[PDB]
Design a protein around this ligand. Structure first.
Ligand code: HEM
Length: 153
């Protein structure tokens, strides 16, 4: 569980993300694909993108990044009370996209990296620890929902 203080650090940095959701989304997706190239294989829509500049130029990827971060933001703002928001995400990611928890670890790393790159003065060690706990909770709860659907992490 996160403390109220921890949730407030999470939401304080998230408000920074909300000042440019598209830009943060692009950076996070690109960081994910750069650091863990195998993840790009999961995207029939994007795996044709051959360079970083192509990725940055893709309106489709940018739109998708906003969708991703909008869903994550909606989850984080519930401060753990996110069953209604998490269930449909688990459904699609378990049964359609087939995303293992290890890949959710990869994107969590990418999120931390981008938030620190863009907002170091509002994302120090304690804030990173809080965001890490929030994303750990998300991964734990989604893994439980995966199993409920018959998908083994
Ligand atoms: C913070 C973690 C994540 C969030 C919040 C998130 C959110 C979303 C949302 C909202 C959608 C559109 C609706 C849906 O299909 O559920 C989506 C689609 C998708 N996600 Fe994720 N996602 C996450 C992690 C990942 C990861 C790590 C991968 C792959 C390594 C992935 C692969 C996909 C794919 C392939 C689609 C379909 C894209 C398309 O063709 O339109 N997701 N995601």
């Amino acid at each position: 569980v996160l403390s109220e203080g921890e949730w407030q650090l999470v939401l304080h940095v998230w408000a920074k993300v909300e000042a440019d959701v598209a830009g943060h989304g692009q950076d996070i997706e690109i960081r994910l694909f750069k650091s863990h190239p195998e993840t790009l294989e999961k995207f029939d829509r994007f795996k044709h993108l051959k360079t970083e500049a192509e990725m940055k130029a893709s309106e489709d990827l940018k739109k998708h990044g906003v969708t991703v971060l909008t869903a994550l933001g909606a989850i984080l703002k519930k401060k753990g009370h996110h069953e209604a928001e998490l269930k449909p995400l688990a459904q699609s990611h378990a049964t359609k996209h087939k995303i293992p928890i290890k890949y959710l670890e990869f994107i969590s790393e990418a999120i931390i990296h981008v938030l620190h790159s863009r907002h170091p003065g509002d994302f120090g060690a304690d804030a990173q620890g809080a965001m890490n706990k929030a994303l750990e909770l998300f991964r734990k709860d989604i893994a439980a929902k995966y199993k409920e659907l018959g998908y083994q992490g």
